[PDB]
Amino acid sequence: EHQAIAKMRTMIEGFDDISHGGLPIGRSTLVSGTSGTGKTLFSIQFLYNGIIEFDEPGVFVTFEETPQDIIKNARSFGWDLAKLVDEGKLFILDASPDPEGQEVVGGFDLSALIERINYAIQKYRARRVSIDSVTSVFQQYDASSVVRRELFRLVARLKQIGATTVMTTERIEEYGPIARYGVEEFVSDNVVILRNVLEGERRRRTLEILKLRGTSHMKGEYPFTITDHGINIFPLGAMRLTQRSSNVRVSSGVVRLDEMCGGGFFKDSIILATGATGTGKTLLVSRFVENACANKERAILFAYEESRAQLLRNAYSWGMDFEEMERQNLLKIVCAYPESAGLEDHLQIIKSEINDFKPARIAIDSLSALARGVSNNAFRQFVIGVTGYAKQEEITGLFTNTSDQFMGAHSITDSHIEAITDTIILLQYVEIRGEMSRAINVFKMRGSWHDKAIREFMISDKGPDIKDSFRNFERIISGSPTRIT
Amino acid sequence: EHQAIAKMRTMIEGFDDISHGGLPIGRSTLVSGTSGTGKTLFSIQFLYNGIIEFDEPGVFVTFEETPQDIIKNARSFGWDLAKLVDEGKLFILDASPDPEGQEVVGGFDLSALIERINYAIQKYRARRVSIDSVTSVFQQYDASSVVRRELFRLVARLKQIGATTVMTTERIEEYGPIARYGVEEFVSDNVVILRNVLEGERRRRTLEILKLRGTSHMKGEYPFTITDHGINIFPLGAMRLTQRSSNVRVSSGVVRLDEMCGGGFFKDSIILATGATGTGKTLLVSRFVENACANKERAILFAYEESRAQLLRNAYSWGMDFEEMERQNLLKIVCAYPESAGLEDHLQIIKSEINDFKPARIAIDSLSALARGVSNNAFRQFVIGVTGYAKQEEITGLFTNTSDQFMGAHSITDSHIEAITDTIILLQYVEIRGEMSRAINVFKMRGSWHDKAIREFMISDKGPDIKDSFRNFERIISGSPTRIT
Amino acid sequence: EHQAIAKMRTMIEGFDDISHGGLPIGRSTLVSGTSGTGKTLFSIQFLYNGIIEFDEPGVFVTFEETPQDIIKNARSFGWDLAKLVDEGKLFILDASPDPEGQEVVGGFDLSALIERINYAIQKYRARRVSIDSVTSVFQQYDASSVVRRELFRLVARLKQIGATTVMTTERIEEYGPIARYGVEEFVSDNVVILRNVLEGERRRRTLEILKLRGTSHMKGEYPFTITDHGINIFPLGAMRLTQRSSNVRVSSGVVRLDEMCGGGFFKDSIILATGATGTGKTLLVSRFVENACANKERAILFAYEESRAQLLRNAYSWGMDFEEMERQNLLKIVCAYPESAGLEDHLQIIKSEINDFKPARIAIDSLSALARGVSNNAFRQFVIGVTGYAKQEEITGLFTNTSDQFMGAHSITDSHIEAITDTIILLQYVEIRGEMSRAINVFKMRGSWHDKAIREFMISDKGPDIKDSFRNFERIISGSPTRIT
Numbered sequence A, B, C: 001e002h003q004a005i006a007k008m009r010t011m012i013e014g015f016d017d018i019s020h021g022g023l024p025i026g027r028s029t030l031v032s033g034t035s036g037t038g039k040t041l042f043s044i045q046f047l048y049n050g051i052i053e054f055d056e057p058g059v060f061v062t063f064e065e066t067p068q069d070i071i072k073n074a075r076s077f078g079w080d081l082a083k084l085v086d087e088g089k090l091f092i093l094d095a096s097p098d099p100e101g102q103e104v105v106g107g108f109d110l111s112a113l114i115e116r117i118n119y120a121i122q123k124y125r126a127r128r129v130s131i132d133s134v135t136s137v138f139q140q141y142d143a144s145s146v147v148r149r150e151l152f153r154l155v156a157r158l159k160q161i162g163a164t165t166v167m168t169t170e171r172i173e174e175y176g177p178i179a180r181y182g183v184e185e186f187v188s189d190n191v192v193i194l195r196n197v198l199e200g201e202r203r204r205r206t207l208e209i210l211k212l213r214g215t216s217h218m219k220g221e222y223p224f225t226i227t228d229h230g231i232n233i234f235p236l237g238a239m240r241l242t243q244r245s246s247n248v249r250v251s252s253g254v255v256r257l258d259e260m261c262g263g264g265f266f267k268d269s270i271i272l273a274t275g276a277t278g279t280g281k282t283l284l285v286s287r288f289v290e291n292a293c294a295n296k297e298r299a300i301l302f303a304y305e306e307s308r309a310q311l312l313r314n315a316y317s318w319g320m321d322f323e324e325m326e327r328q329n330l331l332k333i334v335c336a337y338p339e340s341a342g343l344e345d346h347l348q349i350i351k352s353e354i355n356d357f358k359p360a361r362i363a364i365d366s367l368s369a370l371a372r373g374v375s376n377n378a379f380r381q382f383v384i385g386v387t388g389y390a391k392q393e394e395i396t397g398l399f400t401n402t403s404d405q406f407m408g409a410h411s412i413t414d415s416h417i418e419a420i421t422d423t424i425i426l427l428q429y430v431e432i433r434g435e436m437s438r439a440i441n442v443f444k445m446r447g448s449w450h451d452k453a454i455r456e457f458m459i460s461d462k463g464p465d466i467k468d469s470f471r472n473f474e475r476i477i478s479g480s481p482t483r484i485t
Ligand SMILES: Nc1ncnc2c1ncn2[C@@H]1O[C@H](COP(=O)(O)OP(=O)(O)OP(=O)(O)O)[C@@H](O)[C@H]1O
Pocket: A033, A034, A035, A036, A037, A038, A039, A040, A041, A042, A076, A077, A170, A226, A227, A228
């Protein structure tokens, strides 16, 4: 009846979603990767979480490191492994080579290693075991035939013991063999690969589960970051299209625009404002976050094109006061360049700021800034992540997207994200009698009636002023209309 | 007279179509692939199906696994191999190395292995044999010259016995050599390759038959998935252009549109609705599935851009009630992100939901959502698969495709799938006197008369309201017409 | 005086054209390729044809196969090698290793092999010899220096005997070395390579002659297929631009169109009908094949976009009766998806159906369907092949090509095949007073006067109805004209 294999949760954020419940119990898992991919962190975090979350003792077998550096490095992540050792929950088995040039055999006594591991497991009643570097042994006997045999023996004995084991191995190439010998991936039952791929001049960390014998999992690579709390994976494919909806309305900060939108924006919606540079997109954003503050709601403004000081100045020139909204702890401004962090990191930053500040609304100053140097697929996934999260958390979201052209536009955005957006506002230039006028239109609104008029508007020190449609002109959308009466 | 070689059906969905009847009888088949490609599953599923479908006993020769893990892993697929062993239909021959560092010869007694296999075959009257890993032997003698000889001996003896054998081997590279030594593909009579190709950040499983001596087969790769029921292959090239047709009509849910279509849509047809975001494509979809329910017919709505909760809200705003249609078990809504599954998996999901719910109609909320991150060829094949299936099963199908531009469109779709579609509905924006109006046109309808008018329409809380053509304007299709009277 | 070297015809369709008369007499030919490329079939088909066509006895030297499997596999192609052995015309020399682990020398007695071959040649008065796998010997002594020497000895002795020999060798990579050792291509006088290249997810079989010492040949790769009758090569470059012409006219099935074409279409011509989907291209095709049947001529309709059942329905809606035309054995309908076969196979299928049915006319339902997933060069070659063949066989050919856009077209086709077509018919949409009207124009006709008018036409249940030109409008070709009076 499709009986599942029982699994042990790793509690590594996002991992248990990818693996569909964690790692199979009583089996080994092989974690491979190039230097700097976070293999050691994965195997430490595995034992650490087991001990504190489930009260499951464990053993860390060390070959390259020493117990002192394992503990010292761990401290950077907020956890204390020395404490767990003193309490008899964590045990580190030191199998290092020692800083000596002496040798006796030239090989390695695998049998002795296994018996020492078995002893440690029984003594501490370990449920979880990690091995620092299996291949640190095989270097003394590097034929693929002997590697297969010796690895088989280690894996088989661990199964007999019953402890769940995470073995660490190593690779040279990001897209080369799973492990050095082309053997380990055929012997082990469960294979996980950590990568740190260099593309252009940036690095992207990704995790993949190649296989889990006897059980299902998500396939392909999923991005992750290493932060102060350890490994945090972001399996976008695990996000479901099950977000809630409502008929609750919120003001845009602009009264006439609220009328055009049929009584304000929906609270539970994504709003995209597009247009050429200088059309006033950031004016609507500033008024949006102000309205939240006016009603004593928290809001976060994520700035990418302008510094905080410049935002304050421009806001004052429009009759707004950002410093006052900050003093009341209603408005928070987060300024960074798109280039200061990876796209994966920007997503994490947005989520972290939301979790700490608990906003009713957020705004993204420029999606086109975030798209710089980003492929269409990578960018789109970011947008889906941010908008999906905002919907999930019931946060009203206003997003800005700059057009690459100011006349003759055939489209509203070139990012192809208008299928994600619920409400679209267009700001465009219109050339009337030798002058560069502006116009505003509500292009669509999924849950409501909206105005159809393309209305002229002006920007003053009181903010936007929306007037009448261009009734006596043709070809307004093109930006270069002709007068007919 | 072109005498065919008799074949043994594998009963692996789609495999017997690719192989033109299964595997040649009394011959070996070599199945190669990288770790995690499902080689073991293929060879187990082969023996399993033979035993339950044709009552043909078989032998599984094990080198890396143990009988206990073979059985335990198998259980995840719903079948019980332990039961078949107890009944004397399935036999597992344990040729594992044992978890010991001891050795006697350093090579392998192939003669002893063959005699043990022969014994098992005669004892259980086996017709089918599988070998877990032939190359687990060759590792002890890795010269290409000895591998060729020893493999030849194994294959030749199996032919003399008469049992049909599926041998498993291994590869390192997806597009490299068929097998490790560059030998096995020249010795074996029948060669099958399983791949798990990483492209971008996604994996695609494919199956290929490289050759079958003395018999024809389909060529190239064919996609497959591994599901709860084992391997399921989707050989699109095996689908025939032989679908039925009729003059039966069904209502669109919109009375005026039914008139434009000459008396409703054809039941046995594919309908494509295209247009820019905000033109009301999802309004027609909602009314389409409602009409089915109104007549007490089942329908499935496959949602990609909107969650269930949002669909319910938007439907209520248009005077519809989706929850009631669900309570009557007439309407089913399936919501998922395009990124949550592979394109191959989306096709399988659609087919599975149809098989379980038995709909009269289906609708695809957004083909352009499914096309995200998908090459033109991969996408087109998906569309052919879904539409071909819907025609085959006599299911009325409504598909939505968003335009990337809202003005100056030269085409109806950029996916080049309009040659598949039988009926095409276009929704466009028309700029009239400074406002963004909408228009609807039936572009084509293969089996019927249709209206030619491009008609203005409005969307209210009663749904679409289709009016008159723009008789006094020119250049309506461009979206920015000029008035002439 | 440019004395040629006498050649021996292989009678392998297309091969003797590429080789300019077959293989040089009294010399060896090396056939290399990867597993599954049809090397064995080539060498068997060579001996087989020699025996039945020229009554030339031959010897097949076997290393990997056994006589029983050679015969059994051969039967699938309709020929019986056992019969030829019994009659003393075909001899199979068994040089297999036997299914034994025993060895005496560890090398190979080449001298003994040669003497056995010589004996067989004299005994059966062989003129043709094939060798199953030369490299099955060299595996026991794999240095490039010994391979060169031993191969030289074999080739030199065969020349002294005088028999023409086709040797088989093997490769790992499709575009790598000609043979495993980088030797055989320098020793042998005549080198032929068989490939099975994987591009995207499809395989293409091609044949190339790398060199023939002392004689000319066609260069580069030429596509081939393996069918029930063995290897069939399609050397498009061997086709000559020497097709016949005449002033014979045939009706289009539409009376008014016949007038526009100056008295009907030329019998010996290629007619291309282009336009956007829904312009009635398939209406003209249906009437075209009907006219043939009306005059009691056979015609084949090759369908790619529509099933037979749908074609019948749509034809009935236009006042036609396809089933009746089938009963009289005048109309034949061949339905398949473009994806069901390779482009090379589609060409072969068209030729085979023509040879069996002996049509006066053929029609291709959609060239744009066949172009799916096909590069511009591969597609164009297909079109040249089909149209060249149709002209050669004096078959009137009507081809359909769908436009990717319906407004603002600058061109008639994007396939760049209008230079092949003799007569071009354009169907376009014209937007008149808010409606989507249609228009028909004869764009060109190489051998005749044709009308210049762009005429409005309607489609009813009586088929097309062609009226008057748009005399009072400008910019008709653009599809969005303006009225001037
Ligand atoms: N507190 C922290 N905050 C952010 N990043 C950190 C922190 N601590 C460590 N890192 C990063 O995480 C990475 C973890 O490296 P790790 O030791 O897991 O690599 P490894 O694969 O074990 O190395 P090797 O392959 O040489 O054994 C480090 O390269 C470091 O840059």
